[PDB]
Symmetry: C2
Subunit: 573 residues, 2 copies
């Protein structure tokens, strides 16, 4: 055949395939449907985590709820999602997430495969590896003369005597040999049961794929790093089985790791802490110690495995941080599910067409196909997307509630590396103009510290300080139903261009299904005309943590408000 | 004759004049008497200001007491002083200070001159000007055949017909012509009456002499500068007449000057302020503003002439600062007279001989005369020279008692030239490590100033602050009878040398009286073994001016104590 560019010699032209098979009305409708489907899949994704998250959060303590038992409660949504990402991929995913022991209605792997065979063929042809096509040449021969999944199972059992030696002899699939084994051994195979049962091999391939992606995608290196750290444990595949997702995600992502056997590497911390260390590498330094005392040393984010049964050995209520952290995660899931990403809250985000009338004329001249003038604009109206108090109040509750705020703030402000140097320099000499007054100095940098220390309320923790910084008013006096951040207005999408080339777009492997791509589309996301307003822009607190004549919680809140306005002016629109 | 060095050819030698007229016992006794007489004249000077100062201070308000009416009350002391500075100069000064209208027993100029004619001859021969000897050639002829002052007056009247044309024709004495005029016109001439009556001419010669001394003595330029500024006014000679010294010294030394007539130069300030400006030129800069608000702008040191009758025009009690300042000066004189430089307090300073036994052998060999081995040592035992509270408490009372201490200290500390620059720099950017927290800065350098300002007691003035800095305890609770500084121990004087040349020493002019001088005497003043102790080395105050958690009056007091110890370790012994 013709690889990628000898194809674009007999496929486009004056009256050749692409030009005569792509119409101006077709181009216009597909361009509009591109934005429409992107918005629709974004909305379905947002509601999906917000329909499953509500079930996660509302689950009672001590009652396990797996990652897949909740998948059924949103199964249709997945279908919708995946019937909008790719036409025809609606039954496959809805069947896939029902192919597990935790699903309400089990369906076998053979039922999963025979029904949506064409969709599986497209997905396999979309894989980046060429060699898979060698295994794809017998799929049509495999599915010939088959009317039900039972016949497919029988024919695969007949062909096993040739399939399994080829799999074993291939070094790439040599480790895979057990998998396909029971794919021909039991008629009641389930994809997710296999995934949770073949933990080691699947983790090995996942680690290799993630390492390859890291070597290929340095820009998202943090996400691949956290994924690899997650999948370094075989038990990380217990999510796709009979487990508790609201607990497994806590013991995988918010729990210290000891994945080694030499002497001890238990100091590996948690996944979230390592991700914060990577993402806050050197952006902030002085407050990093704060992160060391409140973010890197909290049992709700760093559960400190094997240390709970070290000094107590009696299981106190506070000692067991595996359920308090699970409760905090469940509360966060509750709020993100039914208060932020709910159907009602997501309903006030409307993608309205603006012009959608101009005809996208196509000009053909020899081996070319260009769009005369593409100009479509869609207004995404954010309505009033009330991010209520609780999306960030739950994250505040993740922070420890230890009342020891004086010592931590003293260490952060005064017992630092820069303030101490200035202290010493002013003690030995200094105070310009005065000079001879050196005994005054250890009476000057002592009340300067003393008033700051005495301002800090003895009964307020870092939760209260962060509530003053963000909410303004005190946490106990801040209503969870109020909106912390409200998104209003609308932002424009301005797909545009002149003389834009239209060229054939193929799948990853050899396939008879082809699309077309318009290259060089100026996709201007004019994010202006949106207002990300802090509803609590004034300090309403009555018992500030650092109140007094040296009120810093109010100053910190004003700093937060100003920095939020700056972020919404530069990072946003 | 032989000028200075051809004289030291026939005056010293083997058996020549100086060698055969100066004995080893004579050298020893004169060397011992040098230290003894220096100590004695120092003690008599100290008691003199301390016997006259007591009379100055104890004088009631509104009763004038001239500089010379008190001179009589100590007249004998002057004689003692001046009979120890130079033998025979005992009757002359005691007669001189009685030759005024303010003296209790008036004596004429002729009585002053004929009696101690020889002493006047020595003093005139001690004047630096050579030409005076031309007028000294007729003194012996003038005093021939005279038995009383009446005969001297008659002979000067006879010789006036030749004396006064010579005085008039001489340009140097041309301005002097009126003076000698009444020196032959009235038989009841008084030296100090003439001095106070011939103000202009005497001020002119004094100004010329002081300018010459300034051109000759740059090291004591400040003293000559204040003297010239003092004598720039003719009325400055009103001290030697019918006036009030405790008031005249206040209106000459602690009063603004307006000595000009062009438009106005009243901003010339006082003599003490100008002397402080010269002596505190650039040693202290930041606290100079303090001196601007409390030392340069106080009516007790800068009386602000012609401004009292400018805005009030009703003579309020506080407005008339000419008697409040006079009262403060009288209180200081009272304390220095009968508490610090009293006879009882000065009695505990003993000059004791240590060895005073070694013979000062003299070796003569050709034109030389050397001391074989001079070694005398005298111990000055300071006893307990209690400088009581009041030598410095009165000077504290000279400072204004305005309760406005907050504004002045705020200007000195915060509203300065260096703190404001740091303020601006930290406001625009800064706070290293933080960076993004710029709104916190106008909440940081606001309590830093606020606590310092709030510490300052509203009812305490600079007098109280200086009392805390120096005395420790509050001024109202500090007893004036207690000793601020006590001098104890003793210091040694170690006149020494080997092979020290002894050569003739002559007067300023041609004279028949000659002394001898030993050159190169190592006069080691070993000031060690003395203890200048602050009796109040601990803060006993109960109402400090800057009390609180930012106690600065206590810190200032500790700084003062440490700096006093440093001064007594380096400036002292």
């Amino acid at each position: 055949g013709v690889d990628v560019f000898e194809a674009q010699k007999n496929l486009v032209g004056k009256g050749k395939y692409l030009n005569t098979h792509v119409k101006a009305e077709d181009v216009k409708k597909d361009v509009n449907a591109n934005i429409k489907n992107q918005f629709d899949i974004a909305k379905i994704i947002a509601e999906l985590m917000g329909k499953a998250l509500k079930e996660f959060g509302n689950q009672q303590e001590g009652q396990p709820l797996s990652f897949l038992k909740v998948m059924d409660k949103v199964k249709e949504d997945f279908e919708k999602l995946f019937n909008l990402v790719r036409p025809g991929l609606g039954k496959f995913v809805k069947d896939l997430i029902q192919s597990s022991s935790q699903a309400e209605n089990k369906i076998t792997v053979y039922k999963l495969i025979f029904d949506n065979k064409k969709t599986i063929l497209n997905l396999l042809k979309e894989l980046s590896i060429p060699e898979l096509n060698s295994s794809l040449g017998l799929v049509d021969v495999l599915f010939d003369g088959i009317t039900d999944s039972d016949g497919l199972y029988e024919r695969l059992q007949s062909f096993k005597d040739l399939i399994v030696p080829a799999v074993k002899t291939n070094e790439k699939t040599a480790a895979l040999s057990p998998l396909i084994e029971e794919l021909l051994t039991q008629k009641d195979t389930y994809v997710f049961d296999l995934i949770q049962k073949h933990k080691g091999i699947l983790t090995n391939l996942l680690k290799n794929f993630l390492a390859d992606f890291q070597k290929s995608t340095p820009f998202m290196a943090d996400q691949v790093a956290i994924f690899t750290e997650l999948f370094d444990n075989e038990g990380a595949f217990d999510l796709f089985g009979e487990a508790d997702f609201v607990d497994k995600i806590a013991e995988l992502f918010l729990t210290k790791r000891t994945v080694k056997n030499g002497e001890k590497i238990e100091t590996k911390d948690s996944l979230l802490v390592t991700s914060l260390k990577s993402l806050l590498g050197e952006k902030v330094a002085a407050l990093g110690d704060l992160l060391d005392s409140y973010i890197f040393k909290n049992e709700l984010l760093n559960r400190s495995v094997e240390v709970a049964k070290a000094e107590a050995k009696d299981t106190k209520g506070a000692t067991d941080y595996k359920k308090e952290q699970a409760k905090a995660l469940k509360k966060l899931f509750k709020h993100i599910g039914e208060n932020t990403l709910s159907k009602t809250n997501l309903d006030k985000i409307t993608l309205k067409e603006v012009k959608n009338t101009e005809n996208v004329e196509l000009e053909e001249t020899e081996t070319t196909l260009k769009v005369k003038k593409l100009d479509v604009e869609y207004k995404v109206e954010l309505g009033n997307f009330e991010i209520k108090n609780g999306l960030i109040k739950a994250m505040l509750e993740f922070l420890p509630d230890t009342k020891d705020l004086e010592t931590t703030l003293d260490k952060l402000l005064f017992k630092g590396e820069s303030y101490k140097a200035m202290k010493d320099k002013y003690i030995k000499e200094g105070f310009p103009g005065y000079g001879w007054a050196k005994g005054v100095v250890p009476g000057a940098f002592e009340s300067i510290e003393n008033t700051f220390k005495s301002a800090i309320d003895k009964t307020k923790s870092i939760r209260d300080l962060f509530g003053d910084m963000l909410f303004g008013n005190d946490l106990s006096s801040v209503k969870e139903t109020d909106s912390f951040i409200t998104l209003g207005g609308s932002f424009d999408i301005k797909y545009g261009g002149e003389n834009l080339n239209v060229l054939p777009a193929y799948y990853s492997l050899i396939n008879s299904e082809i699309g077309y791509q318009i290259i060089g589309v100026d996709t201007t996301i004019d994010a202006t005309k949106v207002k990300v307003e802090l509803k609590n822009k004034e300090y309403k607190g009555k018992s500030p943590a650092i109140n007094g004549q040296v009120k810093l919680s109010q100053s910190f809140f004003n700093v937060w408000t100003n920095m939020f306005d700056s972020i919404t002016k530069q990072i946003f629109q």
